[PDB]
């Protein structure tokens, strides 16, 4: 048996079932392009299960009594494993519909509303968008000029050289500050769509106006090529950013996410961040279904004694809502 909860079982970066969970992600992709939440869930935590199993799926035999596995899930992993190919699938790939959505959500500042508001709108390409300036935002914009970079997979390599900046940015800004990766890359990952840091400072309230000194320091070092500052509204202060990332003989655009975060909540901001997606959605949906608490990047709150969950560390917060630990390189749900 295999726990129903992405948060209870690890998962880790590699497994044997690539072909298969990538199938049926494709599924759950085109489903969110739709608006439709429920196929996007039932299709992702299909492919999470595939992602936990220790042994790869020869047989359709080896479904047999597996959590998240209805009648949809388990007839593509049939077709793909009788005729190496699923019909749905292959449909969904060349649909201009999909092709189209997963180009405008894949831009800089695009969600799926926008996407289809402009795919509603007539808008195919990325030479339509940039015919309609008037049509986006700042962001979108910055998303446009550096498109080509942005795809590019980011490397673990230029992880390092954007700590390394950051974290003498931040060091000459505030000495006792620290700079911790999240994201994708803090789960191990070789490679992602952008660098997630988390920003804090050990005493309370010292982080106050960190980043925007942080974002001078690296602006003149001409290490910026697109900054959007938002306070917090409540709700971390972030900065939206591209950076201009030096190479031998080169440069590339690569997006990076700052987010500052007051130490209390530093545990719950570092938990959120990274991730994965899914693994958070079900450590949230766990909490409050399983526990009758509401888990945040904030804090974990008890909405009947109105009281809040003091946190050293991620291991707190897992004791605390009953969950074995589980290290970031086994949240890869
Ligand atoms: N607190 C908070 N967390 C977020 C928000 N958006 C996404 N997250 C979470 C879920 C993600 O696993 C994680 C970082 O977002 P990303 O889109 O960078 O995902 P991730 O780094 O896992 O994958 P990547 O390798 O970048 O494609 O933070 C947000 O607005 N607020
Ligand atoms: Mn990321
Ligand atoms: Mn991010």
Known sequence: WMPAYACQRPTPLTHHNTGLSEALEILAEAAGFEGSEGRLLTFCRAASVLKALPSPVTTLSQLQGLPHFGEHSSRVVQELLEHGVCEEVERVRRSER????????????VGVKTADRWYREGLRTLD????????????????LQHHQDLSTPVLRSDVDALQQVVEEAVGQALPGATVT???????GKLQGHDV??????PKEGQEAGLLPRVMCRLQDQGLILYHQHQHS???????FCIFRLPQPGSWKAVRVDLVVAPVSQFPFALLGWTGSKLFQRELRRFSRKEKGLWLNSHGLFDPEQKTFFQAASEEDIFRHLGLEYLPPEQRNA
Do not use: N, V
């Open 233 to 239: 509204c409540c709700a971390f202060e972030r900065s």
């Open 181 to 187: 990766l999240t994201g994708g890359f803090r789960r």
């Open 98 to 109: 999909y092709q189209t959505m997963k180009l405008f959500t894949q831009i800089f500042g």
């Open 196 to 201: 997630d840091f988390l920003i804090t400072h």
């Open 128 to 143: 339509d968008l940039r015919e309609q300036p008037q049509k986006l935002t700042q962001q979108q914009k910055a998303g």
